A paper describes a structure:
As anticipated, the single point mutation in the nucleotide-binding site of CcmA locked the transporter in a closed conformation, shortening the distance between the centers of mass for the two CcmA subunits from 36 Å to 29.4 Å. From the inward-open state of the nucleotide-free Ccm(AB)2 heterotetramer, the E154QA variant switched to a fully closed configuration with no internal cavity of sufficient size to accommodate a cargo molecule of the size of a heme cofactor. No heme was bound in this sample, and we obtained one data set that contained CcmA without and one with bound ATP, with only minor changes to the overall conformation of the complex. Unexpectedly, the overall stoichiometry of the CcmABCD changed for the E154QA variant, in that the closure of the core ABC transporter Ccm(AB)2 consistently led to the loss of one copy of CcmCD, resulting in a Ccm(E154QAB)2CD complex. This fundamental change in quaternary structure led to a structural asymmetry of the two CcmB protomers. The outer protomer, however, now unrestrained by interactions with CcmCD, underwent a conformational change that most strongly affected the cytoplasmic termini of its transmembrane helices hI and hV. This latter shift would have caused a significant clash with transmembrane helix hIV of CcmC and is therefore the likely reason for the dissociation of the second copy of CcmCD from a heterooctameric Ccm(ABCD)2 complex.
Here we report cryo-electron microscopic structures of the heme translocation complex CcmABCD from E. coli, alone and bound to the heme chaperone CcmE. CcmABCD forms a heterooctameric complex centered around the ABC transporter CcmAB that does not by itself transport heme. Our data suggest that the complex flops a heme group from the inner to the outer leaflet at its CcmBC interfaces, driven by ATP hydrolysis at CcmA.
Numbering used by the authors:
A (entry chain a), B (entry chain A): 1 to 203
C (entry chain D): 2 to 69
D (entry chain B), E (entry chain b): 2 to 220
F (entry chain C): 3 to 243
The structure:
Amino acid sequence: MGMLEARELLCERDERTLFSGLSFTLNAGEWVQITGSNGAGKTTLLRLLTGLSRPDAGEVLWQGQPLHQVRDSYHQNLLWIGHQPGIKTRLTALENLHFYHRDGDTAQCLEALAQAGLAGFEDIPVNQLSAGQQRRVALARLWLTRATLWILDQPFTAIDVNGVDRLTQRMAQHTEQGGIVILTTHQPLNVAESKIRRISLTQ
Amino acid sequence: MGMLEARELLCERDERTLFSGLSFTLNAGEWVQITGSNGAGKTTLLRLLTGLSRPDAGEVLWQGQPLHQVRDSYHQNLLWIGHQPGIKTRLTALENLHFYHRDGDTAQCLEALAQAGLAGFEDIPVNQLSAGQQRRVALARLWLTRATLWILDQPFTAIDVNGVDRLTQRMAQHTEQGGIVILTTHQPLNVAESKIRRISLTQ
Amino acid sequence: TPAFASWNEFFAMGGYAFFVWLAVVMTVIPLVVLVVHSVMQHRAILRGVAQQRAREARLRAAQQQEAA
Amino acid sequence: MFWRIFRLELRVAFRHSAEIANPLWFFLIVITLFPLSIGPEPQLLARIAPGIIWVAALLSSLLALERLFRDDLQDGSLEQLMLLPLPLPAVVLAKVMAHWMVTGLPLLILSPLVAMLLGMDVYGWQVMALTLLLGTPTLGFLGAPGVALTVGLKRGGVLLSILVLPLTIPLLIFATAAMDAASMHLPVDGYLAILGALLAGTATLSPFATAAALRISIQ
Amino acid sequence: MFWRIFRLELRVAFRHSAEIANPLWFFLIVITLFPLSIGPEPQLLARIAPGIIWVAALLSSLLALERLFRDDLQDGSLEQLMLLPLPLPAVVLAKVMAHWMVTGLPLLILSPLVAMLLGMDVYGWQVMALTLLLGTPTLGFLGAPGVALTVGLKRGGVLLSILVLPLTIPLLIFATAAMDAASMHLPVDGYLAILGALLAGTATLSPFATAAALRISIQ
Amino acid sequence: KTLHQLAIPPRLYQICGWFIPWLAIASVVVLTVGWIWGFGFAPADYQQGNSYRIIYLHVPAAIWSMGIYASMAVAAFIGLVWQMKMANLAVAAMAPIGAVFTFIALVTGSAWGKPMWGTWWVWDARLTSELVLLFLYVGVIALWHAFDDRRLAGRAAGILVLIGVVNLPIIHYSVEWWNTLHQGSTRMQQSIDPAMRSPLRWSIFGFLLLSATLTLMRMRNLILLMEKRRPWVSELILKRG
């Protein structure tokens, strides 16, 4: 049995059925990429898989227990990035990363920021940085987390090609071990087609 | 003489330096892309060329006259689309376009919105729309304006696959008849190197 | 010539002395604490620049280690 | 385009109504608040309510003042409103005028109702309403540079009130003295002329420097 | 991580070394602001001190109450607070308890000086502190749900503002009557007891309601 | 000439370090002789008595509070005219000195009003004006310590100081309307004897010198804080070692 599965999900926003009855089971160590065609509907589905949005019909299931019951263990194994970074603008990058778990000592600190591409910009305020860097500080969480499941909503937006390559290289190691990630980008991604499994929305 | 001229823009700021000594000139009908090393500095450069932020040293020229005096003629021949969407979230999309000049009658209405791929979603509120098509609103602004100078900061951000080809042709048809466009992007363009100029942020 | 002949009545001015000396002590305290604060902040920022020099001294040491 | 900016600001202020209801009910709760707590002795109310109404309007408008430039930065509207083919002080004047007619104007409409709860006469209502008319544009003009200085900062709290209220004290002094004297059936035309000169001074000075402060803050 | 949420809210509130003074000075702005209009006579001020300090405290709390639930929506940090491995009522309890650091205890520090400025007596200062220590947290806990509902999907016209301000009626009417009855020497324990009972009730019932309110707000 | 080369920050540091110690010695000796000749070797006024000597510790600092605000305007106007970015740091240098002088003026004025008023604080004239000046100093301090960046903070502080010095005569004339109407007060400010007034002028001179010393050395502290990584501070700390 897979870790995360989706059963007869239905979404409706203002007389438009965005998606209806989509169901998919995700096995451990997989690189599912939702394709989509419209701007919104991929974002709502990625949001609803994480449990922000209660499904109108159907349910999303995690080791056989639904998301309204097993929350305290579901939130302990998830990493989410959205269109907005989710960070605090006034604080420094170091404190914004230190809010979340671990960081702290150098075994989990100052290389997570460095491998993202942010050497020499650790102490500068986030407001005084690029929007690409304002999302890079959010993408730097991947190197220190202990979450098995990652759902990222447009990760490669205004990050340079070196950052994209280093990101996907980090994603490969999480793919080899037991870990499920769902990402959605408009840009094509430069890895072999056989490893990525396409779960496209249908109507 | 060139339409847009630069002279020794020094923008060393905030206990560091960004660039030094650029004096690039643009005559009528060119295409230019600012080179990409980091997330920003290019954005600061574009804000210096449009006149929002004052230079530390050096100056820019529009038709041989400094920009602190020719504000009216410069403001009558420019539009700005940056990282910010530039639209009001509360209002609907049609009147968001209608605030800018003309629109109104159908000779400038519903095809400025239709040709950017946002057909069928005119009277919907912006808050129930994706951020990509929120940016496509500001991209749809391009079809109904007659400004000779375009300064675009990240147009190809959260934009669908068809939107790139839809946008590039329109910027070309702006480009022949003396339309100067100053572009910043991270996505590659399906455009030959010869017709596009490259002005680089030297170190 | 002095208006106050006795040294003791310089401390007791007709029963109004305590409020005058309260004015004196609340005159002395803020100016002295301002001067000590500013001198201490000057010395602290000089020491911070010294420790900053220590840290890129270690950075150039690490660069020499990388070069060698 | 001046009236076009005026129309857009009125439309975007009227499209929502959650944040315009807070200052009006703040005014109402202060006016309902003080007489019940103080007591029903009539010798006190006729002299204390001149301060009460004006400071209630003052604190209501300082609660209202945060909407004027804060939301436009995250929407990118300021970066285009500085780019229009019109000088920035005219646009600032249009936006502050719309801000007055969205929250300062209904105080005059509510004035016949607020006169009922705390006594007064018809002459007191007329003087108080006309002084509100001459006073609230003055308050908006004096409060514009504080908001303009506090655009780029995240802070939407006590700092704006700290910057505004010491600048706003003379209006409160003159208005309270004027309508307190008007309660004594004495002519108050000179204080009204002083308030008018204050409005003329604010209209001359404030939007000319609010544009400069807004240019400083965004950069 | 409960205390870590506490410390992060304190760190986003206070930024530099000497920055705590502004919530302290804004209260003095209001406390001087009322006699600028009302008058200098030292008996009427002793009469009207409860309305003074309670309107000032309500203004400070309502001014600083926005950052609880409004700012974190746009930056998106509220969502990853919602998905932090800790129950949401504990999270909103931490956030409102961090909000109490901004308004309540600076008020408790500055209570002797504004008591001295408003006359009163030592018993007035004692009951003043004993009712402020019980009135500020219930004010924050009662102001939280209306702010929680107003963050929801942006279509609501006028009705949501009734949930936030007009709930302060029993709290403030009970507090001001107690503080006025403390002016003439009388037993006042029976009102402090019901204020403490209201504090305990709202502290028990507020975070669990605001968790469902935040669940409803973002869908 | 030398005014053009005055704006280079290492040269400004060097001339400031030249000026500080002699200025401080002159300030402390003039303030010492002023306080000695004020508190001793002088009689008291007939009516209030020995409390009258507080007119020393109240008078110059208070007026120099006003004075330093004027000086801040003299900075701030320049900081808007030619965009001399060095002039904006003087506003932050002079602001908390003015705040401390206004606080000490308010404390002395409140403490000296006891023998007639009874209550520690009575809402009389000149004290509302000092409180408003203290509030303006609080606003300038908050606006300086509010920005994350320093140059924007300095220019916004200059704008705020310009607005304050524009609006200040209106406040100073409108508060006086509380002194004609709404009862009256006694001549507490400068009810002086004409024969013995030189210690007060020497006290005026003494604070002036002390205010200059504190504002110069704080301007030095800010010019160290501003130019953090530029190599002239590096040469300074190398000369230290």
